[PDB]
Symmetry: C2
Amino acid sequence: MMFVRLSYHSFDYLFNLFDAGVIDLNTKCPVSLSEIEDYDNFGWLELTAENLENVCEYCAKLGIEANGSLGDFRYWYSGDMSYHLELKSDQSENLEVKIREINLKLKELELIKNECLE
Amino acid sequence: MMFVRLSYHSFDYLFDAGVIDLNTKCPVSLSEIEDYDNFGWLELTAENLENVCEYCAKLGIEANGSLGDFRYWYSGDMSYHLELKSDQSENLEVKIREINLKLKELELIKNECLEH
């Protein structure tokens, strides 16, 4: 079962605060670290053949871009570094194929935004 | 056995990322790493803990404000982050508190040298 998690993280220099957590990929509601008890197990979404598209589309809305990996780097960061996406396999599957798929889609979505400037 | 790893990730140049070897302090790109998830880990001991935190602090890595099990530390500019893991599912909460503690001591020290 492959999964996907979307994290947020930033630093507020005014308050000297690290502000991180997970965005629930169903409700799209952010959940801070303070409210998360077992972090490594929290906020994952089962990645399916149908929801892949929807996950990539929402990540593109946050400015998450293809990661340039030809290999097994399973992380995608937003341009402002406020968010990132993470892919995992709970049975040690070779993720190269899903990473390729995600990168193609994110890169397609980035070029549609560039084009949609008319 | 606990281990730590220092990653970098950055857009200012198009995106790049990699691992910084915690001995050699030398950067290694994604392009050059086969099995990224198993790459660049350093065993954490009482002997090196201090040196690791001092280098992290050099990069602006600060305490993560966690009162629990968040095992990551980011730099203010978000260019780097440190990660802690166990290979034996060891509970990490106390080591996280020691790293947080050490990065705050180092931040206080830095703020004191910022008053001439």
